[PDB]
Ligand binder design. Structure first.
Ligand SMILES: O=C(O)Cc1ccc(CNC(=O)c2ccnc3ccsc23)cc1
Length: 167
């Protein structure tokens, strides 16, 4: 038993809710919240900008030190950093950005990072401003992630569409 509430169960291990991932993280304080990161960990907008804003920019300060030491992530890759006031840890995962021409097949590689964590609160990778089809992203999630994932979908209209079209 865990503390996530109000989720619809899609499969053995995937759950979904219409929620703002920032407020969901603030209440649950999960072990892992996933950020929709880019390779530079520049958290300017979308999920990343909202998560970073909720940390009062501490996420960005930590991220800048990470990049200065390690260089950029790979598309499809990830790193574990602090969750600040939102979670124990933040798993920064880089899905392909269709608005940058990145290969959508890298979406499966991105979701594989979730398997290193037993339970996660996460957004749909490559959705929103990353320009992928959220329905495809949900399918890849279900077919790739084997650990327990609680998906937060900010847009109520989108949430209803993902549920109604789920196979
Ligand atoms: O919700 C988030 O977590 C981030 C986010 C993703 C997408 C949109 C735009 N809406 C849609 O793409 C959309 C809305 C309703 N039906 C469909 C069907 C195929 S796409 C689609 C806004 C926010």
């Amino acid at each position: 038993v865990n503390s996530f509430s109000g989720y619809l169960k899609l499969t053995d291990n995937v759950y979904i809710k219409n929620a703002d991932i920032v407020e969901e993280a603030k209440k649950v304080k999960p072990t892992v919240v996933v950020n929709a990161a880019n390779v530079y960990l520049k958290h300017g907008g979308g999920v990343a900008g909202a998560l970073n804003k909720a940390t009062n920019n501490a996420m960005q300060v930590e991220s800048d030190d990470y990049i200065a030491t390690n260089g950029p992530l790979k598309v499809g890759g990830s790193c574990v950093l602090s969750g600040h006031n939102l979670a124990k840890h933040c798993l920064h995962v880089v899905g392909p950005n269709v608005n940058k021409g990145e290969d959508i097949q890298l979406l499966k590689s991105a979701y594989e990072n979730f398997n290193q964590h037993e339970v996660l609160l996460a957004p749909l990778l490559s959705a929103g401003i990353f320009g992928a089809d959220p329905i495809h992203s949900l399918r890849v999630c279900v077919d790739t992630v084997r650990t327990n994932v609680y998906l937060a979908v900010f847009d109520k209209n989108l949430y209803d569409k993902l549920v109604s079209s789920f196979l």
